[PDB]
């Protein structure tokens, strides 16, 4: 019996920023989702069309795990059909989704007295993101007409901005770690099954 | 549709940067007010300099946006708020001169001292000095010497400074496309609305004059009654028909008449509701006081207080090697951080101040969803009004008995109601004429109506017309009397207190009527009534995103300020005063003077 590597996904010394979100492919292992209930009271655990407490009764070709860290108020933007900043410029989910998200508080690990400036997010972009698309570019946004030759100033700003977490913030602004599990079944047998 | 998108993007960038640059300044100020240390002062200064520079640069940049092109009201409101930063849109040398004048005014007010006509050993100051000696003593000469000396020092040393301050401030105001500095102050109440709702900033003078006209009949009677009771403590000094001497009003300037309570008790045999003994017997501390306040607030539908509020806020004197400031304040720091700083103790006054500050925080939490530039109060005096309406319905006998600090079989006394109403009257009604007179005087001086050579000649002339006080000794034009107030020598406006009083009573009547209560208004309580909470939260969550004529319409169902609720509040006292004044004379004649 070879269990799936979930333990190394939900546990990590350092996560990734929202714009440069990580993605892990899980395939050819036996998956026990019952160990996913081994954390503190989950702030968000809601599953779209997969019928939880029955995860152990299905089989899929491969599973994708996407992990990042976002603000408290933005957790509602990791649902299909939503509109905002994270759901439009950083990370967007398709309307026909199959899987679910797990979001839990991480204030005791990602907050410092002077501010944690290692987490960044995108604020300006020309057009929205297609589902499951990653942007990492650092070109200076142009809002006006006069180009500024790649220097910050009026009508052209730096797209990426920091969160700056502190332990004294309110609950809606404390850091939250989010892991999205996406399942898919395809015409290529099926290797990810239950016990 | 061309610069609207640019304005939206610019406002997004400003909102992102301003929160981060403001949290540090607020946190540094908090760390200084709870520590007091040499390093913390430098930290606060270096935190504030960055914010000031960034805000000035952003305002100057935002000046380049024509307002006529924008259609959406919210963005126009944000940009109008951001542009109005003409506090230093002058020359450099004039700015330095004005700053020097302000600093020397503040220093000369803070460091002033008065020496006794007899042996100069005393040479007291204001601090716990002159304030106590003319807030407790009942001797004519002891009060008179101090009152004359403080003026003969401060006004003499302040007149030329105020003379230059007037012209510098007028130049500042006219440089900002205004008419005078009084109009600059009055511009706070200006609002623009769609379906009417406009409040031209020139109507306030008409409004303030109108409402006061309906308060004169009540105040007059009070001014009679107190006069009678002052004829016993100082027998051969007050004429039966005339104006009260200035130095006998229980305070340095006559702003409040509270300290006249001992000599004006109508029924001395009945003591007021004192609950400190019950709190001591029951074993209470500060934490229980604040949990009680939170329970009262949650009983009406408002939300609880965050865990950060309990974790971070200072609630007692630390009793360590740390010096702090014990002035009670409520702090909102941004990013969901709310705190109270209070050196609270076990007494009724602290119990009510807790409700006041907690109401401040409730309003701050309510308007926390709006954009950053609109996270302010709906007006200049809505904050206090919201704060005081909560403390009003917390000292009522019904609420005190409902929580167990009073006997369950308590019997209400008709004689106690009059005493409570009289104390509230001396606290509240006695300050409106003073504020109105002072603001009218400063407005007239700034507008230029009063000549430079007649200032005091007008100041006293219309002092014994509205408030009704006569000077003990004549003052020449070399004097500058109004410079003695802290709210005159150090700037600050003075009309917020006139609007707050009326707003609080309008709100109280609206909420107590919405809670289905019948009886006297001053006995109404809003605890355990969910209907009033939603009506209050309807206005509390708007901030200033909409003109103040709309939040008031939402709550009280009107579009201006009305004094009828205040008249309903003091009706029993009005009837009792009229009954007891039916033999004497009401009103005063502006001819009597203690001097020749
Ligand atoms: C993560 O690490 C903690 C502590 O090392 C451990 O108790 C836990 O079992 C690990 N796995 C999960 C899924 O929490
Ligand atoms: C108060 O100041 C001291 C000395 O600068 C500092 O060590 C401490 O962290 C400050 N804050 C406290 C005591 O809460
Ligand atoms: C009224 O509100 C208070 C809030 O302190 C609560 O303790 C009480 O149970 C409520 N009901 C009555 C009947 O007093
Ligand atoms: Zn207050």
CSV table of N, CA and C and ligand atoms in Angstrom, one decimal, chain B residues 292 295-296 299 398-399 402-403 527-528, ligand 3:
chain,number,residue,atom,x,y,z
B,292,UNK,N,-20.5,44.2,30.6
B,292,UNK,CA,-21.8,44.8,30.7
B,292,UNK,C,-22.1,45.7,29.6
B,295,UNK,N,-22.7,43.6,26.5
B,295,UNK,CA,-24.0,42.9,26.5
B,295,UNK,C,-25.1,43.9,26.2
B,296,UNK,N,-25.1,45.1,26.7
B,296,UNK,CA,-26.1,46.1,26.4
B,296,UNK,C,-26.1,46.4,24.9
B,299,UNK,N,-27.6,43.5,22.9
B,299,UNK,CA,-29.0,43.3,23.2
B,299,UNK,C,-29.9,44.0,22.2
B,398,UNK,N,-34.6,52.4,35.1
B,398,UNK,CA,-35.1,51.1,34.6
B,398,UNK,C,-34.0,50.2,34.2
B,399,UNK,N,-33.0,50.7,33.5
B,399,UNK,CA,-31.8,49.9,33.1
B,399,UNK,C,-31.0,49.5,34.3
B,402,UNK,N,-32.8,46.8,36.0
B,402,UNK,CA,-32.9,45.6,35.1
B,402,UNK,C,-31.6,44.7,35.2
B,403,UNK,N,-30.5,45.3,35.6
B,403,UNK,CA,-29.2,44.5,35.7
B,403,UNK,C,-28.8,44.2,37.1
B,527,UNK,N,-32.8,49.2,25.4
B,527,UNK,CA,-32.2,47.9,25.6
B,527,UNK,C,-33.3,46.8,25.4
B,528,UNK,N,-32.9,45.7,24.9
B,528,UNK,CA,-33.8,44.6,24.6
B,528,UNK,C,-34.8,45.0,23.6
C,3,LIG,C1,-32.5,43.0,29.0
C,3,LIG,O1,-31.1,43.3,28.6
C,3,LIG,C2,-30.1,42.9,29.6
C,3,LIG,C3,-28.8,43.3,29.1
C,3,LIG,O2,-27.9,43.5,30.1
C,3,LIG,C4,-30.2,41.4,29.8
C,3,LIG,O3,-29.3,41.0,30.9
C,3,LIG,C5,-31.7,41.0,30.3
C,3,LIG,O4,-31.8,39.6,30.4
C,3,LIG,C6,-32.7,41.5,29.2
C,3,LIG,N1,-34.0,41.2,29.6
C,3,LIG,C7,-34.6,41.7,30.7
C,3,LIG,C8,-36.0,41.3,31.0
C,3,LIG,O5,-34.0,42.5,31.5
